[PDB]
RNA sequence: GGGCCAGGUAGCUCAGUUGGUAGAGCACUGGACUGAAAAUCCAGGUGUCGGCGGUUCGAUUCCGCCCCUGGCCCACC
């Protein structure tokens, strides 16, 4: 119906940006971004009115948002910067070639891919490529983004783009860039499943040294990241119903040898979840002594005591140790399995003494 | 429209962690009190401590998804 309304209003609308990429990559998304030649606000208003839904206008930006079913739609007026702007001008201001394309929703040309800069070829050749040499200068954040994309789609930076990125970082543009944008970009990064590769690209181009104060790369942390990769794989394999956010674990491993002050500062600026802060604060100090205790563990009940109160993340960090791996595993798929019938339980009840008794019975069962 | 921090406790205004049987100040019923009423006295409702599942013998607490309010945040690729 969008093409019909665009027909009536004498306008031209196009699906634009990452969405198009995801369409050509086959990935389905419920977030659609439109670029309109002419007024996008009226298009959004009318479209929202016909489907009988609410609309959220933004006149100052010249954009509007509306939600139809599971679809989240954003209509944006074509602009030449971050006189009427042509679609080409709206596309030329973007980051990468694969992100610079468009698909016409206009009825006559409907189903046509609009690609000026050859983003189709770069999507075909698995190449992350900037539109112009000044790209990373304009928005330093794109640097991270580039790597991020190169992480997810398994693409490669062109030699041009690589030199330009390295030049951008070497000019220290990463520090001058807004902190919030960078932090949020990293937040987007750690939510990727291929985020480890993104960390390899962060290592290669050394962006984390610029963003994070005091951060350095050694081999131990890297191998720890790979061990964490295997652990995450197995855990998300068998125990997958218990899944939590894995990227934050990698983030903890990165900041592991870092100072606690800059660490708390970083988790502060990153707005990390509560359990992440708990896990980190527990890791910086109590982790060592806990490991020592798990090493001294003989009976299974002591293991239960030293494990059960802990979160899943802590246990995942305990799987780093080879000696504790089979022990933590045995704790997961075995050490907790139990129940009790009616009559017996009723006899266990014949305050806190009930709980103590129950624990005595469980420790009577284990060993 | 996406993150998080909080805040979510009575009718309003607010505290509460090693999981273990819940509180304040003013309105609410009932009776003693009155010609009626109020003050005040005795007491006692002050409540599925957001909604729904899960773990647990047991969840206001541990975790997961959602409901609401407020603020910080990005708000493009």
From Swiss-Prot:
Mg(2+) binds at residues 31, 33. ATP binds at residues 18-21, 94-95, 99, 139-148, 152, 181. It comes from the Bacteria. Adopts a seahorse-like shape and consists of four domains: head, neck, body, and tail. Belongs to the tRNA nucleotidyltransferase/poly(A) polymerase family. tRNA nucleotidyltransferase involved in the synthesis of the tRNA CCA terminus. Adds the terminal adenosine residue to tRNA. Can incorporate CMP into tRNA ending with C74C75 (tRNACC), with very weak efficiency. This is A-adding tRNA nucleotidyltransferase. The chain holds residues 443 to 822 of 824 of the full protein.
């Amino acid at each position: 119906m969008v093409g019909q309304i665009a027909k009536e209003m004498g306008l031209r609308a196009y699906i634009v940006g990452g969405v198009v990429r995801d369409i050509l990559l086959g990935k389905e998304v419920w977030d659609v971004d439109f670029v309109v030649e002419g007024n996008a606000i009226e298009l959004a208003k009318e479209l929202a009115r016909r489907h009988g839904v609410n609309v959220h206008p933004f006149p100052e930006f010249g954009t509007a948002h509306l939600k139809i079913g599971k679809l989240k739609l954003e209509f944006a007026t074509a602009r030449r910067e971050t006189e009427p702007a042509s679609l080409k001008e709206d596309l030329i201001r973007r980051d990468f070639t694969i992100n610079a394309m468009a698909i016409s929703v206009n009825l006559e040309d409907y189903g046509t891919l609009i690609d000026y800069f050859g983003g189709l070829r770069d999507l075909k050749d698995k190449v992350i490529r900037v539109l112009h040499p000044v790209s990373f200068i304009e928005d330093p954040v794109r640097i991270l983004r580039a790597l991020r994309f190169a992480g997810r789609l398994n693409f490669k930076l062109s030699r041009s783009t690589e030199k330009l990125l390295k030049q951008a970082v070497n000019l220290g543009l990463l520090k001058e860039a807004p902190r919030g944008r960078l932090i949020n970009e990293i937040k987007l990064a750690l939510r990727e499943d291929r985020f480890l590769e993104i960390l390899e690209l962060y290592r290669k181009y050394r962006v984390l040294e610029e963003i994070i104060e005091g951060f350095q790369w050694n081999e131990k942390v890297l191998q720890k990241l790979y061990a964490l990769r295997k652990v995450v794989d197995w855990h998300a394999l068998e125990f997958s119903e218990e899944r939590i956010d894995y990227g934050w674990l990698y983030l903890l491993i990165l900041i592991s040898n870092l100072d606690y002050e800059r660490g708390k500062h970083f988790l502060e600026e990153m707005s990390a979840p509560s359990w992440v802060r708990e896990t980190y604060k527990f890791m910086k100090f109590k982790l060592g002594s806990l490991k020592e205790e798990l090493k001294k563990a003989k009976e299974n009940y002591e293991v239960y005591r030293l494990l059960k109160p802990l979160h899943t993340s802590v246990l995942l960090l305990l799987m780093l140790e080879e000696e504790l791996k089979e022990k933590i595993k045995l704790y997961l798929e075995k050490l907790r399995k139990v129940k009790l019938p009616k009559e017996k339980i009723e006899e266990l009840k014949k305050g806190k003494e009930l709980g103590e008794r129950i624990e005595e019975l469980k420790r009577e069962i284990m060993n």
